[PDB]
């Protein structure tokens, strides 16, 4: 399947780093944050990737180009308006096609093995959940809306079916309410990942990920 990487956000809490650099090009341990995803995707056998962008988006295109250096074909989805995750994915659907795709929040750093999502999955969505740094509860393989313990946090790593966006409301709407609607129908499966995950939203979070990356290096 194809993958979409979300890379539209302003990264206001990562200033001043994000003043002239969009968050996905911020260096984490020697390497742009999004390049972890690209190398991991390509290792998992993904060959086609859509990236949406907005804040400083033309710099993302200049840096990554068509993706051939990563063994990838990358297509881009520019946004003018702030579209939120749902609107943004919706906007990109023509580039993704009718099939389920892998959705990765670019802000994340993780050693999750993406090749795991190519195994037989179930529902309108399959969500990777992680320990609270909580909004979902996992009951066996089934994801339900959480109530605070032990609830868990959405990692920003999933497989989603385009139909989730039926059919669907052009322009700016969040992803979570779609996921709850699907859950309410028993159409969302999930797993609890116990390895490393960091939402790189602050300088402090960036340091945390640098530190964990240094450990894996050895």
CB-based contact 161:144 (threshold 8 Å): no
Burial of 180 from C-beta contacts in 10 A (0-12 / 13-18 / 19+): middle
Say which experimental method was used: X-ray
Residues near 12 by beta carbon (within 8 Å), at least 6 away in sequence: 18
Domain 1-218 has CATH 3.90.550.10: yes
Backbone angles phi, psi at 206, to 5 degrees: -65, -40
Place of tokens 């001043």: 16
> How is the chain split into domains, by residue range?
1-218
Residues near 48 by beta carbon (within 8 Å), at least 6 away in sequence: 2, 3, 72, 73, 74, 75
The token pair at 98 is 């009718």
What CA–CA distance (Å, rounded) separates 37 from 109?
Answer: 8
Mode of pairing for the β-strands spanning 101-105 and 31-32: unpaired
């Amino acid at each position: 399947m194809k993958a979409m990487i979300l890379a539209a956000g302003k990264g206001e809490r990562m200033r001043p780093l994000t003043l002239h650099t969009p968050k996905p090009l911020v260096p984490v341990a020697g390497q742009p944050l999004i390049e972890y995803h690209l190398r991991a995707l390509a290792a998992a056998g993904v060959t086609e990737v859509v990236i949406n962008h907005a804040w400083l988006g033309q710099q993302i295109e200049d840096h990554l180009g068509d993706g051939s250096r990563f063994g990838l074909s990358i297509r881009y989805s520019p946004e003018g308006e702030p579209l939120e995750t749902g609107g943004g994915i919706f906007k990109a659907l023509p580039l993704l096609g009718d099939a389920p795709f892998l959705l990765v929040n670019g802000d994340v750093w993780t050693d999750y093995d993406f090749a795991r999502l190519q195994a037989p999955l179930q529902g309108l969505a399959h969500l990777v959940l992680v320990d609270n740094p909580g909004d979902f509860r996992l009951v066996g393989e089934q994801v339900v809306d959480g109530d605070d313990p032990g609830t868990l946090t959405f990692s920003g790593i999933s497989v989603l079916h385009p139909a989730l966006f039926e059919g669907c409301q052009a322009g700016a709407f969040k992803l979570a309410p779609l996921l709850r609607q699907a859950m309410a129908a028993g159409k969302v499966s999930g797993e609890h990942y116990r390895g490393h995950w960091v939402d790189v939203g602050t300088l402090e979070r960036l340091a945390e990920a640098e530190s964990l990356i240094g450990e894996r290096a050895l």
